[PDB]
Enzyme design. Structure first.
Site, PDB file in Angstrom:
ATOM      1  N   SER B 101     121.450 -29.519  31.396  1.00 21.34           N
ATOM      2  CA  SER B 101     120.619 -29.991  32.505  1.00 21.34           C
ATOM      3  C   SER B 101     119.923 -28.868  33.270  1.00 21.34           C
ATOM      4  CB  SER B 101     121.449 -30.843  33.472  1.00 21.34           C
ATOM      5  N   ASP B 241     115.273 -34.667  34.009  1.00 21.35           N
ATOM      6  CA  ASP B 241     116.169 -33.522  34.005  1.00 21.35           C
ATOM      7  C   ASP B 241     116.405 -33.068  32.566  1.00 21.35           C
ATOM      8  N   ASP B 243     119.116 -33.661  30.662  1.00 20.47           N
ATOM      9  CA  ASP B 243     119.825 -34.651  29.858  1.00 20.47           C
ATOM     10  C   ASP B 243     119.371 -36.075  30.150  1.00 20.47           C
ATOM     11  N   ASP B 245     119.377 -37.618  32.899  1.00 21.78           N
ATOM     12  CA  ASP B 245     120.318 -38.243  33.822  1.00 21.78           C
ATOM     13  C   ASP B 245     119.763 -38.297  35.242  1.00 21.78           C
TER      14      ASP B 245
END
Ligand code: ATP
Lengths: 149, 366, 366, 147
Positions: B101, B241, B243, B245
């Site tokens: 991330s 981001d 990932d 998320d």
């Protein structure tokens, strides 16, 4: 209908097995006493011969042929933009989406013996000619497809 | 952190801090841990972000876990929330994702996505720590029978995309958006997802070359996606981001919309519509203290969980609540997906803008 | 000799003799000895058999390949001849085939070839064994830009399929063939090459199973191929091996036609077309005395060297000829291939039978 | 031939692949030989529709490798290798797939369908000449000139 289609049955079984290990749940057809063409006249069919790559790339989800089922005739499957009629009974197990229930409906109304890979039910099961089977062995699927191909 | 587990799995630099042989060891002994707690052959998943050095650690762990018996089907280049949703949907017994991330390109993630569907359980981490802590490697090494073939799961983009189209909750078409891919988890599925709502798409950094992850685009310096929003003239923003998320966006004016601001917007659109049936939503005290004042003015009760989403999900499981998270933008609709999903948060914000009538220029002003 | 690498590389029992961790050490050590004499980041290719444990060791080697910076654009189903031809036409620096060949599935065999076309020389394996047997750790680990990224060469196998078809120099139509892959690597190239050549298709054990490679079918058990070829009325029968190292022939009479008869037929056909040699074709001393007697009666010069395919290759390279083959079936037809090629040998034999018109029954006269 | 459906379908498929960034390099032949280079790859001989073209050119899929060469009002190719170019003015920013599309400009006599897998820009190099980065209406005019 030839030995090339006989080997295409084994290729389709291999594609369905590679889908079963990857949960690519779809429904296919092989006519068994009447034409599916009245139900197979919905979309832009192909009539291309049953090849492992074509079906294995066609019946993937989230793509231009995810919906509906595969309808076939001869050594060929008429693309995928036309599914058969669904079921009408509720005494059977309610453990699937459109796929297993609708293929069993094709068993109930049409005379079909339709191979339908299961995403909602994981494995591969066969409903055939007014009857069915569930989660059978790979050898059973190969023998059934060779016998009623 | 246990004997060899980090915070959300294994976090470190590939071939600098962590060892690739240690990655294969954390695959093999972890496979033994997964095998010693479930009847039958354990079926798992695997995932990795588009980091430059990332593929080495994922390959080493996939090779190491391939020996212990659990035939780990692998699906590279997919989101962590996508991997979790696929693991909880297709019927997996375990899963893996690899992403770091907000960190730079010098490190890559390693996360063992547990069989529950949330983050990895405590017993699994303790067992993996025990089997990487003992000296001898007494796992049953199958020679021919029992070895697990590596079945590629390249269709893993399709299922994670299919989770977005069900979470659209209506069309996001007509509007004009900006989706900065940031050479990360958005490089595989998120462009096709935001296109799948049939809207006008303007992408930034969607041509990843490996070493371009989280560099001058994304959740590290959001002024670039805002400059692209100003030049392209699209309505709303989206900047994923590493990932997929977290979530953040810029308005049609160009300012910064906070994570707690996106939380307040989603909460207003929820509590108006009654979807948040646990209406006292969870919250984090890691956000600004005025965010809780805004929530209290909004008429939605809020609790306080520790910084990070672990105890947030723990309280969500304890008191049976649906929405609650940190200030990073993890609008984790637990009734719509598995865990923190920036794509799902963007879909929910697009739904709020589509149904609320008012555009994005008025939602963040609460 | 090396402790693990030997004549045909390293062949040990999977997860018993050569640990997969040692394979993840071996790939990196081979990279750190591969980049010694080239310039820039050198490239390689990799292939393997159809064994279930074959994927594990190949995956471990690919994982180790991203430790010293060895970029791989490889595949997973080809013959050793395929990797040799890809190394020869690709200008790369290394090539490795992962297969134990005629043995059972309880062992796998990893051997790195030589980029010139022959196998790797003594210096390469000696330095790799020096790197592995060194106690310390000095392999550099590329974290920043400089580490490679793996790529799939699935379209690259078409080059290996076409080059053999190109080296055929004549259609294989008419002669109704019955190929015998027998759970080897010929399910990827031989079926397509024969179908494109308008030949006949009847393959026994063409479906890989994972533990069925070279088990009761193939070079160590040629009964089933001959039985099916006799039962289906095949005018010619050919069979391969697991690594496709050797080649065996199925005659129309239901007998066994061996590598000595294959070498005699190829030598006579090259004598007719004037492309055997200057005057001398190489020979291993393990061939039947009747074969060498018929060769001496034929008049082609025979030379006998040390027993072993490596000695056969050395004699071929030193004696300036263009052919060499032991009675097991490894036939170096260097006029069309870089190294041992069962498929190219079968193609040359079928073209010999097409051009000369000599019968399959009488092909074993010498 | 009056391919008011065939060219429209190919144009719709090309635009759909371009907007969503689907990476491929397809072709439809012309009045010279194109079957010898096409016989190499997998065979489908598929009926022509835009949706099936988007399916066959879907990325990371079974038939996702190699060109798509079409004959007449239908398509018949899968992963058949085209001859590459040798002209010196090849753009480095153009892909190796785009380089292969530039391959046909002197060893064939047709156009191709070139969609960039990195940026999605339009490209065509036909009859020796070329036309690149054309809009949807501009590539529509190109296909009308092809008809
Ligand atoms: N001669 C050829 N015939 C058919 N397909 C080819 C040929 N050469 C390349 N290709 C296709 O193109 C791919 C490689 O091209 P590449 O991806 O480098 O180019 P691109 O997509 O145009 O550009 P970029 O990689 O910058 O997106 C191959 O995997 C294959 O699918």
């Amino acid at each position: 209908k030839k030995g090339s289609l006989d080997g295409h049955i084994s290729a389709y079984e291999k594609s369905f097995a590679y889908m079963s290990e990857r949960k690519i749940g779809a429904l296919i057809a092989i006519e068994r006493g009447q034409n599916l063409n009245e139900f197979v006249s919905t979309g832009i069919r192909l009539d291309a011969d049953i090849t492992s790559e074509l079906l294995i790339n066609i019946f993937i989800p989230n793509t231009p042929l995810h919906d509906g089922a595969v309808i076939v005739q001869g050594n060929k499957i008429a693309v995928t933009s036309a599914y058969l009629p669904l079921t009408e009974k509720s005494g059977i197990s309610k453990q699937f989406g459109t796929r297993h229930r609708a293929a069993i409906g094709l068993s109930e109304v049409s005379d079909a013996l339709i191979l339908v890979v299961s995403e909602e039910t994981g494995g591969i099961s066969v409903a055939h000619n007014g009857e069915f089977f569930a989660d059978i062995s790979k050898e059973k699927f190969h023998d059934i497809l060779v016998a009623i191909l | 952190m246990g004997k060899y587990f980090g915070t959300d799995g294994v976090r470190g630099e590939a071939n600098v801090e962590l060892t690739p042989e240690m990655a294969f060891k954390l695959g093999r002994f972890g496979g033994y841990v997964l095998s010693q707690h479930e009847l039958g052959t354990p079926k798992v998943y695997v995932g990795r972000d588009t980091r430059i050095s990332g593929q080495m650690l994922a390959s080493s762990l996939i090779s190491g876990l391939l020996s212990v018996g659990i035939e780990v089907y692998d699906l590279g280049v997919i989101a962590t929330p996508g991997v979790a949703y696929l693991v909880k949907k297709d019927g997996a017994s375990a899963g893996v994702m690899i992403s770091a991330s907000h960190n730079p390109a010098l490190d890559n993630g390693i996360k063992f996505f547990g069989g529950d569907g949330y983050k990895l359980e405590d017993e699994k981490e303790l067992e993996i720590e025990a089997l990487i802590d003992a000296e001898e490697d007494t796992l049953p090494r199958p020679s021919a029978q029992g070895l697990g073939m590596l079945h590629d799961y390249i269709e893993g983009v399709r299922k994670y995309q299919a989770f977005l189209k069900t979470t659209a909750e209506g069309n996001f078409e007509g509007y004009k958006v900006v989706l900065d891919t940031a050479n990360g988890a958005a490089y595989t599925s998120a462009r096709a997802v935001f296109a799948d709502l049939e809207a006008n798409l303007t992408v930034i950094g969607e041509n990843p070359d490996g070493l371009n992850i989280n560099v001058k685009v994304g959740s590290t310096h959001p002024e670039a996606m805002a400059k692209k929003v100003v030049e392209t003239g699209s309505d709303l923003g989206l900047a994923f981001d590493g990932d997929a998320d977290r979530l953040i966006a810029v308005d049609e004016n160009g300012e910064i919309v906070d994570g707690d601001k996106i939380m307040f917007i989603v909460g207003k659109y929820l509590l108006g519509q009654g979807k948040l049936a646990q209406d006292t939503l969870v919250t984090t005290v890691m956000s600004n203290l005025g965010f809780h004042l805004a929530l209290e003015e909004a008429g939605i009760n809020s609790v306080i969980t520790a910084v990070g989403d672990r105890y947030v999900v723990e309280e969500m499981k304890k008191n049976n609540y649906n929405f609650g998270g940190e200030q990073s933008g993890h609008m984790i609709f637990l009734d719509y997906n598995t865990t923190g999903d920036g794509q799902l948060s963007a879909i929910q914000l697009l739904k709020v803008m589509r149904e609320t009538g008012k555009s994005l220029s008025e939602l963040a002003s609460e």
